[PDB]
A paper describes a structure:
The ETC is composed of four large membrane protein complexes: (1) a H+-pumping NADH-coenzyme Q (CoQ; ubiquinone) oxidoreductase (complex [C]I), (2) a succinate-CoQ oxidoreductase (CII), (3) an obligatorily dimeric H+-pumping CoQH2 (reduced CoQ; ubiquinol)-cytochrome c (cyt c) oxidoreductase (CIII2; cytochrome bc1 complex), and (4) a H+-pumping cyt c oxidase (CIV) responsible for O2 reduction. CI is an ∼1 MDa membrane protein complex with 45 protein subunits arranged into two “arms”: a peripheral arm that extends into the mitochondrial matrix and a membrane arm that is embedded in the IMM (Hirst, 2013, Sazanov, 2015). In mammalian heart mitochondria, the majority of CI is found in association with CIII2 and CIV (SC I+III2+IV; respirasome) or in association with CIII2 alone (SC I+III2). Here, we report the isolation of functional SC I+III2 from ovine heart mitochondria.
CI appeared more stable within the SC than previous preparations of isolated ovine CI (Fiedorczuk et al., 2016), allowing us to improve the model in some peripheral areas that were previously disordered. In contrast to the isolated ovine CI (Fiedorczuk et al., 2016), subunit NDUFA11 (B14.7), the traverse helix from ND5 subunit, and a few other peripheral areas of the complex were well ordered within the SC, confirming the stabilizing role of CIII2 on CI. The structures here allowed us to improve the completeness and accuracy of the ovine CI model and to obtain an atomic model of ovine CIII2, with clear density for endogenous CoQ bound to three of the four possible sites. When comparing the particles between the classes of the original 3D classifications of the SC, isolated CI and focus-revert-classify, it is clear that the closed state particles are distinct from all other classes.
Author numbering:
A (entry chain 4L): 1 to 98
B (entry chain A8): 1 to 114
C (entry chain D2): 1 to 347
D (entry chain A1): 1 to 70
E (entry chain D1): 1 to 62, 67 to 201, 217 to 318
F (entry chain S5): 1 to 99
G (entry chain A3): 10 to 83
H (entry chain D6): 1 to 80, 85 to 175
Write the structure that this text describes.
Amino acid sequence: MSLVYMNIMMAFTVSLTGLLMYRSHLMSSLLCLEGMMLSLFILATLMILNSHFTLASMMPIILLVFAACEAALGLSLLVMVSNTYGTDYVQNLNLLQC
Amino acid sequence: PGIVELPSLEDLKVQEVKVSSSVLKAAAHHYGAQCDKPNKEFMLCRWEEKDPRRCLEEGKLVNQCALEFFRQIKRHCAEPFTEYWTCIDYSGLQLFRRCRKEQAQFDKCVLDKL
Amino acid sequence: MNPIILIIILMTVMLGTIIVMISTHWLLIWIGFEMNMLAIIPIMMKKHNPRATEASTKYFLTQSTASMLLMMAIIINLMFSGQWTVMKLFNPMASMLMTMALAMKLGMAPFHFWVPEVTQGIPLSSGLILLTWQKLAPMSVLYQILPSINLDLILTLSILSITIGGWGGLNQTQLRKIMAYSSIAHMGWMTAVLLYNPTMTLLNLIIYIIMTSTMFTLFMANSTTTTLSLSHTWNKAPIMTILVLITLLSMGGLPPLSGFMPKWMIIQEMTKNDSIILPTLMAITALLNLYFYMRLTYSTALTMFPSTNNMKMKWQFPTTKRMTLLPTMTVLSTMLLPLTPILSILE
Amino acid sequence: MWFEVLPGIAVMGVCLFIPGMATARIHRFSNGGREKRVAHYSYQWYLMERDRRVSGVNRYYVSKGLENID
Amino acid sequence: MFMINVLTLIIPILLAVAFLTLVERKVLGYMQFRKGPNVVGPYGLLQPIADAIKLFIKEPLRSISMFILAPILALTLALTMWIPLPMPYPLINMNLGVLFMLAMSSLAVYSILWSGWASNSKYALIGALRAVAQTISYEVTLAIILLSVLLMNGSFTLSTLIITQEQVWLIFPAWPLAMMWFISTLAETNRAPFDLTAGPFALFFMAEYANIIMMNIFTTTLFLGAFHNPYMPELYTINFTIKSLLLSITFLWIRASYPRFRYDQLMHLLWKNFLPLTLALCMWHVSLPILLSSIPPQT
Amino acid sequence: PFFDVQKKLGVDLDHWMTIQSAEQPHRIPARCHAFEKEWIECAHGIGSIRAEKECKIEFEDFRECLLRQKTMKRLNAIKRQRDKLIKEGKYTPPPHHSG
Amino acid sequence: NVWAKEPVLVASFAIAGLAVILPTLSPYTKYSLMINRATPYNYPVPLRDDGNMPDVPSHPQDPQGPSLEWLKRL
Amino acid sequence: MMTYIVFILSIIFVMGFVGFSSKPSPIYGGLGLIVSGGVGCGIVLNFGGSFLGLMVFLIYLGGMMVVFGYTTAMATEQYPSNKVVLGTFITGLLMEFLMVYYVLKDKEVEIVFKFNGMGDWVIYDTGDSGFFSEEAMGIAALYSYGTWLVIVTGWSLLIGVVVIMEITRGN
Amino acid sequence: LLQAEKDRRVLQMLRENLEEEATIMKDVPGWKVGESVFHTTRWVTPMMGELYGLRTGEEILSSTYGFIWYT
Amino acid sequence: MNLMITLLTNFTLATLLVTIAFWLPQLNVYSEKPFSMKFFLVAITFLLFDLEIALLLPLPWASQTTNLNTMLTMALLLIFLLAVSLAYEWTQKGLEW
């Protein structure tokens, strides 16, 4: 099953848990989302290059340019959060209580 | 599961055309010109049945036609064929537009004598 | 903003959901989900409070991780039998991740933590468009990929979504959280049938979309967000009372009214299998999620709360609002009992 | 005048001249005088591998010219 | 022999940058009325050598890992960025090298931002943030113009480029594109008129001027030069070196003359003057080979 | 749903990115081209469940062409037997550098 | 007019408009199509003889098939 | 310095992912993700890989970490460690060493899969006459075949630009 | 000509490999000697472990990974 | 791996240059003693133009194919959309100072 895929998916799972649990900021969470993006990119790229899957080789470049503009949107949102406060903590977001 | 069919070295022994890169590349136009009329039989064999371990006969045939081709070019003109491929040899990836004088000399050689 | 810019952005929301609808490929489906996200962000934060800022933050994080988990499931699908066709998958694990990603995408009860929080601090147009199109988009994908799903996932998410959407709201007075909990409950009902006959699921989707449009249009009849504002809508106009009454009771699911039709036909094509414990559990919780509807009704439609003057001042002025299409959707969404054999319109 | 700036120019140009000369002489010096076979395509690498195979020296540049005809 | 190739590349980078500093100081001196320097030794060579020595024996003081990690990246770019530069036989025959140029320029932007973060919360770091912003506003222009000037060359391989430059120079089919690209080289070298902006200052200074010599060598290869005659490559080496030297003297010579911009005038000028003109010249270079029936031999 | 403007206008805007074995631009194949051609020609007018029931052999063949799983299993087994018999010392191997 | 206002913009739109329109006038796009179609990469396959075609020349020297001669004649 | 050079670079790749998913300060996380992107570029160029891996390296390292460190430096401070961060690094290092243990000392590793952990030269081509690449004509599609896809891609990016300016105070 | 050489060479590698496998697994249970694991008995292209097994480093590095980082 | 050897030698020699810059002087003598919005617009502006550069730049590898009309069409469409984004922020007074 091409054992590089094993620890790539393992590091994917660890990147996903890094996206999930985080205690202080949000930029670190978005950065772990970018690392997860890199994991998906690398896995798809190694597969399409292995299979001689020459016709639809659009997948890794289009995947990364789209999730790139996703990350740009996340940066603009975190700038708006940090601009309506002094910081970008996970705390001071508890308003609009449930 | 199913056993395989590998024909052994009984049929897998023909003397190779053991010349190098640049000589075989510079001799290519005449190699495809006079001979390589029956290698399209081999290629048609290969594309109509994509199972090598079938077309061994015409692989042997194109090997011996290449060997006879080089014998025929060795006994006759030229010895400056050797000059021509060592002219084209050391030019990195071989631009055919580098060596032109000895291309003309080999042209006049092959056209007059053969 | 500009009106031309809003024309373009709503056009792109339309285009993104259509690309989700239309392609036989996976990449275009993921691009449709992403474009849906990118274009539905600026409809929120249409005003300029930090409430909508934190709501957009929560929505972006959950929406993004759902899209990334979906792309993970697709690349696992091509680790197994390799093609980009939208059909049956070839992994229990990839289908597991795919149903979990779509469950975060639309909102099930393990994943419902962002939905009331994002639907509270936003204007009403943003909430309406996110509810309608974000529940319209993944159900197309689920309709297409249905024959490869283990039933434990859809069943557990459906049961848990109906019961948590029931149990939430009984403490809640904000109307947006009430409607979002109702959205969770109806998405559980829309999910629990899909492995049996998906025609009922898409029919319940149509009915719920028309009901939600009528609901938020009658909440856009004037600027109201709490119940006491609805008591003022009682004392300022009588027709809004009876229309909110009938739309609330159609969300309740009572037989001489149109909102019963998605419930009962689902019960039918459920119970043509040997599923009995599941309909009686789902229908007891469908009895449960009628109580907050009924206390809203009891508050501001049939009792008469005391009101405040300057409603005297408001009496001089006409209701010069715009309605997108209110009465058509209302009486089509309430009196639609005897057209139950318009089930078969969906093929 | 600027007769004196010319030695600095010349010495720094010698310092720019040296790495290309060293590189070119090392390629022509450690490949039997033949230029190092630049290869970008899998066709040419397959050709180079069968070239270094049929030479027997386990060096691709020996080039074994026109002797195994018999 | 391959490590000997590496040593013959990266031992003359020290001598090259140091003698570049004496050359630019003498050249600025004769641009003015100055013989600077000539007193300290024979025509001022031991003065840059011993001055580099004195700069290494300064004994400075002081986050420490970041302060380690920034100039090491800068100088390893300055070393590892003369690899595919095809002084006739390049070090590594990369299939694509120009995109490697772009990637390692972005690594230089990393270096500047890490130094600005290591500068420990200063109005200088705000200025360095602005310098990072202006430096990052240029790799758009450089990549798009580089894309167009390789579009008339087919492949990224750069040996095809040294094939293309035999008949006429490539400066004639694209001169204004070349002009904008040379202004972008002035831009990427972070020197005059594009300014402003602790230790180890010798290593950081070394990184900047090796980046200058890289940009001038790449300029000289990209637009002009001579013919690669085999079995005597030193002729091409000499003619290439002379042209690159004249271009680098012209580069410092244009630095010798004009005041430096305003930051907002720099942004205004960059976007609203280069960027539509890049797009227009590039779409014309796209539609050019289809209207001359001359697409290059992409092998 | 599954809308078919895709078929109503009849444009192959999506039917090239879809599988392997379509028309690659320079006409080069993939690794398991004939396996896809046989499995698709097994499963054309087939109702997607008897596709599981009656195209089993060539689908497993395509899967083991794509991943090459049991071949690597057998290769690992042969290498471990090689390790235990070179630990044994019988025939210090003339596989390498001989026939 | 605007020739003094933003002149680089005017030159940009001018060269852009000619870059858009200018492919409508060409005697050379057919030459581009013939060049970029008639360059062989893969192997020119053989085929079975007995279709009885008055085409498909059996000898590569034989000019009975469609070929190129405007190449060497520029 | 052995056969498993792709596997070793994969191990350093997992090390970098654990290095920023152990939740450090975000500029240290950006450092670790630069390390991760460089070694992932190494992995894909080991598969060759000549075009696409070093291609999007420009977009990933050449376009993302710069903007992340830019925003991280300008927005908040964390200006001058905690046991939870280093404990996450301990757990990641231990699970990595456990995977190394079960790969190298056993036959196969199965979480829910079948991984044959050995020399991953398999799978690879038997030196066919490619003569361009796979990636060359691969990405040299999108123009003779990609009608719809690049149109909706560029359209999505234009909408991305107008979304960004609206959020950051359009107009 | 090169194609015929490649075919002779890969058949030679397969023949050598199956002879050495017949030796190297001579006393193991199971293990049919010529297992095409694929049910369809056709020509399948080997995967460089079927060709370049049992070589220990040198030629498998020059063959599998030779072009990929030559120069 | 040749380029890996080059990277290794350059990295190690540069680290030795840094340690010559730091741990050389043995004479241990005497040890003694807010952000803006318009910074952020430039980065995202660069980012989105860089993404559209990534879309554009495989153009010259594509130049050898038959469908020349569609190539020229979508290429002009891509550069036109890029210039439309630039003109949009240009006319909506975005990047101004």
